[PDB]
Design a protein around this ligand. Structure first.
Ligand SMILES: Cc1cc2nc3c(=O)[nH]c(=O)nc-3n(C[C@H](O)[C@H](O)[C@H](O)COP(=O)(O)O)c2cc1C
Length: 147
């Protein structure tokens, strides 16, 4: 199977998380394509992928709390080929904020509205992802089991 991982990360936490998930999928036999949201074009982005994992950090704001590099993708999610696609979301945040990992909820909800198939509840990491390595690997393990 081929998996696409797209992440938006400012300080590197969601990027570390994406790389950890990418390793788990690869060690399980998937061919994985891991890309920074700052470098992708939304049009047909998901074409040909069996599984798509989208990740992003949350930044408190009055209008949109998604990480800046992910915004353009999020705004054009309807052109990616999400209908009937198996997808799962993940993201880093901090539970001292009201909207803890709120970007994960936002992305899941829009993918659901576009007809995607959410394979597993989103991975929400509090603090340093390096300290949650077991949680990432385990979630990655469960998403492969749902595909
Ligand atoms: C100014 C600021 C605002 C933040 N706002 C939120 C927030 O609204 N919700 C949340 O869960 N985390 C919030 N965080 C925590 C970041 O999402 C967290 O530091 C995260 O690990 C960053 O991930 P990244 O390195 O992949 O961009 C905020 C952090 C800062 C510095």
């Amino acid at each position: 199977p081929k998996a696409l991982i797209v992440y938006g990360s400012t300080t590197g936490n969601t990027e570390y998380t994406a790389e950890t998930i990418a390793r788990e999928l690869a060690d399980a036999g998937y061919e994985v394509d891991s890309r920074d949201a700052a470098s992708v074009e939304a049009g047909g982005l998901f074409e040909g992928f069996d599984l798509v994992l989208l990740g992003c950090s949350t930044w408190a704001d009055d209008s949109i709390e998604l990480q800046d590099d992910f915004i353009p993708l999020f705004d054009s999610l309807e052109e990616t080929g999400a209908q009937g696609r198996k997808v799962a979301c993940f993201g880093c945040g901090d539970s001292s904020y009201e909207y803890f990992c709120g970007a994960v909820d936002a992305i899941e909800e829009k993918l659901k509205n576009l007809g995607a198939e959410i394979v597993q509840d989103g991975l929400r990491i509090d603090g340093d992802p390096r300290a949650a390595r077991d949680d990432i690997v385990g979630w990655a393990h469960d998403v492969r089991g749902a595909i």
